[PDB]
Amino acid sequence: KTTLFCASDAKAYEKEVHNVWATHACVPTDPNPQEMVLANVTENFNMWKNDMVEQMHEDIISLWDESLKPCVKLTGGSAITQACPKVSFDPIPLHYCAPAGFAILKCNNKTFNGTGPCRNVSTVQCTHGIKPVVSTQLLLNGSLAEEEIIIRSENLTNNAKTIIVHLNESVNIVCTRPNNIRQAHCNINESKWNNTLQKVGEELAKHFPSKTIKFEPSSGGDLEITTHSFNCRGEFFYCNTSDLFNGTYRNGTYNHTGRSSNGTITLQCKIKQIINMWQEVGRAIYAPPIEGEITCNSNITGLLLLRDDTETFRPGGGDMRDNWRSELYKYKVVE
Amino acid sequence: KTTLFCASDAKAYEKEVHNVWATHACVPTDPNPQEMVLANVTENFNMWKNDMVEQMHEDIISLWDESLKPCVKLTGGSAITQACPKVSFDPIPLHYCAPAGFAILKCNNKTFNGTGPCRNVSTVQCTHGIKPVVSTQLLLNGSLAEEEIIIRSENLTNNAKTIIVHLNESVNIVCTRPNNIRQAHCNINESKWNNTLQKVGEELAKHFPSKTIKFEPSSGGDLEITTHSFNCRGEFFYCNTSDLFNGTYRNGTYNHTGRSSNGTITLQCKIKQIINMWQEVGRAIYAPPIEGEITCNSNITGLLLLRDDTETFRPGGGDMRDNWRSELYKYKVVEI
Ligand SMILES: CN(Cc1ccc2c(c1)[C@H](NC(=O)C(=O)Nc1ccc(Cl)c(F)c1)[C@@H](CNC(=N)N)C2)C(=N)N
Numbered sequence A: 001k002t003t004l005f006c007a008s009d010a011k012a013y014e015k016e017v018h019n020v021w022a023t024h025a026c027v028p029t030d031p032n033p034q035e036m037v038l039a040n041v042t043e044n045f046n047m048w049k050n051d052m053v054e055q056m057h058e059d060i061i062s063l064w065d066e067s068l069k070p071c072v073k074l075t076g077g078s079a080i081t082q083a084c085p086k087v088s089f090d091p092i093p094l095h096y097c098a099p100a101g102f103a104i105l106k107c108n109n110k111t112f113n114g115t116g117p118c119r120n121v122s123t124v125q126c127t128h129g130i131k132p133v134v135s136t137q138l139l140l141n142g143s144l145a146e147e148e149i150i151i152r153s154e155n156l157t158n159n160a161k162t163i164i165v166h167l168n169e170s171v172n173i174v175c176t177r178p179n180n181i182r183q184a185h186c187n188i189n190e191s192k193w194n195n196t197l198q199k200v201g202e203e204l205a206k207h208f209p210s211k212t213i214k215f216e217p218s219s220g221g222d223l224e225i226t227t228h229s230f231n232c233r234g235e236f237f238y239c240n241t242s243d244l245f246n247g248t249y250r251n252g253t254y255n256h257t258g259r260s261s262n263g264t265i266t267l268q269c270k271i272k273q274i275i276n277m278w279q280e281v282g283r284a285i286y287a288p289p290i291e292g293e294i295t296c297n298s299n300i301t302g303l304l305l306l307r308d309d310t311e312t313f314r315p316g317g318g319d320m321r322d323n324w325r326s327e328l329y330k331y332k333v334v335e
Numbered sequence B: 001k002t003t004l005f006c007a008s009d010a011k012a013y014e015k016e017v018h019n020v021w022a023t024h025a026c027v028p029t030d031p032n033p034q035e036m037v038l039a040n041v042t043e044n045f046n047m048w049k050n051d052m053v054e055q056m057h058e059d060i061i062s063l064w065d066e067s068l069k070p071c072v073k074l075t076g077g078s079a080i081t082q083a084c085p086k087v088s089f090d091p092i093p094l095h096y097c098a099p100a101g102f103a104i105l106k107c108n109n110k111t112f113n114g115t116g117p118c119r120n121v122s123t124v125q126c127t128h129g130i131k132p133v134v135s136t137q138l139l140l141n142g143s144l145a146e147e148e149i150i151i152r153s154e155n156l157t158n159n160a161k162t163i164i165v166h167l168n169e170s171v172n173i174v175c176t177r178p179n180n181i182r183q184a185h186c187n188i189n190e191s192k193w194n195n196t197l198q199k200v201g202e203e204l205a206k207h208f209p210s211k212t213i214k215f216e217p218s219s220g221g222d223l224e225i226t227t228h229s230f231n232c233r234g235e236f237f238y239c240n241t242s243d244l245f246n247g248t249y250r251n252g253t254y255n256h257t258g259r260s261s262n263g264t265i266t267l268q269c270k271i272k273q274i275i276n277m278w279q280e281v282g283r284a285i286y287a288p289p290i291e292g293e294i295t296c297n298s299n300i301t302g303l304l305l306l307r308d309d310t311e312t313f314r315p316g317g318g319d320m321r322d323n324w325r326s327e328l329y330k331y332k333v334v335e336i
């Protein structure tokens, strides 16, 4: 429960901003696979009370703040203009490390969520490679489970608390603004999707006995949370998910209800410059998007869900601390 | 003829050896590569005399050469020793692209079997993502046929030519050495396997008029070919298929005569140190297996067969060029 610090492999000649922040504000990693394996001790974890997240969070905020400068930043009727220079942008892995004395407890093996008991435990100094991908609804470029899909929540019996669904077979998603220049779109292969929501539905049913399971879009709110919003090559993509998070889990099987066509599902995307910042409760304005093909080839690795004779589930997000929690669940700082 | 170049999503921060090699041997892939479809054409392909295969072969040889360094390398009477560190091993997709002045022809006839005429043709810059998986008998993590199973051979009536069966439904296989530190095992669901060999049995029952079609284990030879040999996380697995390739397809129906248990076929595996190199003629000796659970969860996407009243088929392999052919059958390098 003390001051941690980051390590990475960020070359110092790279103009890309995450490297520029890293080099100046981090450390080159270590090739010491220091892994004090153990398997007695059955310790308690809690991925929701865990200061590593707040630590990381207010560092991603720093990163973003130093890096992506909006033309305008409004907050409390207070405008603050500056330069809007387009930059080079791509998540590099960060490792969070503890200084002496004493470091990081890590839970091992397969099906083990974020709360409570766990047996096989190792002790480490730093953590695995983590991209600080800022996104809603869908988790991108993240890790996988080495077995079966697993469900995470501070409380599933609470319709208010975000459900982090951790997958194990990633779903390819491809976003494009071709060569109306804030009109974009995203492709997602339909079978992998139906299959995914099938499995996730199956294990959702294992936590909600004999209820029909309905996947249905978000109720409403800001475009950041009611769509799959994310950053790509500096540009802020807001991607539709009406015909993605609609589908029915019935009888023991799942069937989709989203318009497909000869294989892939297409989502309508809008690039925007006015954004409601995830860092604080203000809003930022950037310059019009760069010209040319604006494309991102990304890996869907997790879901953010929100629950309402049927149980309804809608995509969540908003809070990036959750996005960090999705992978900082494993660990716990100790003496 | 040209000198292709590889392309991948290799991470420079990744210490997994395929990434390490690909980062310095290949180019970053294009996030979105576009086909150019062609009506009007009809071109001939021959998966069995393709140079792309040899090029890829060489590349994977170099890759394995730089990556997996054996403690000992023996070739006849001459032996070489060097450092043999345990590494992180997990294949990544490799694209093969033609340089400027050339292009890659791609057949989209999804019943096309590598040899002969192909009508629906497209041109591309780079191939699809191909994981250079080295294995025998079973082809792992390949692309699936898009409709009915496909039988491939340079020559079917020649029992000396290896037959490549392209499945269209992957058969999950799970190999594991649990917590004897060299004894491991694989698990396969029997139902999927029986459906598989049923349909494969049919597709073979076509090409060979009306004969009892038997599936039997490899008659003999080196363990690398008499067993399902493959690499899991740098460790060389030799898995037993006496209970897998074991059955009879007769007049419409398949019968699995191989031992099973609770619907599961379990292969008995052995992690070896002494291997017969596939790259060249000679033996390689590696260090004892690492500690902890060594598990690989893979998908069977193809089969390698050799044919002998009744027709008998046995698991083949050994020439990894076929393993590349299994994926590179669609493609043809051309100058324009
Ligand atoms: C309140 N709520 C969900 C929720 C929880 C926490 C936060 C928010 C929302 C607000 N989040 C964001 O503004 C936000 O994430 N913006 C944002 C910025 C960049 C990217 Cl790529 C992105 F995906 C989202 C943040 C507050 N920000 C501000 N409004 N302008 C933090 C619901 N009622 N569902």
Ligand SMILES: CN(Cc1ccc2c(c1)[C@H](NC(=O)C(=O)Nc1ccc(Cl)c(F)c1)[C@@H](CNC(=N)N)C2)C(=N)N
Residues within 6 Å of the ligand: B134, B135, B136, B221, B224, B225, B229, B230, B231, B275, B276, B277, B278, B279, B280, B281, B282, B283, B317, B318, B319, B320
């Ligand atoms: C000759 N033959 C089949 C055949 C064909 C070609 C080749 C071979 C065998 C030899 N192949 C191999 O040694 C080989 O593939 N080894 C090998 C290494 C690693 C893995 Cl994972 C593997 F599956 C096999 C190679 C020659 N190597 C050498 N013996 N030491 C290449 C039959 N009579 N059935």
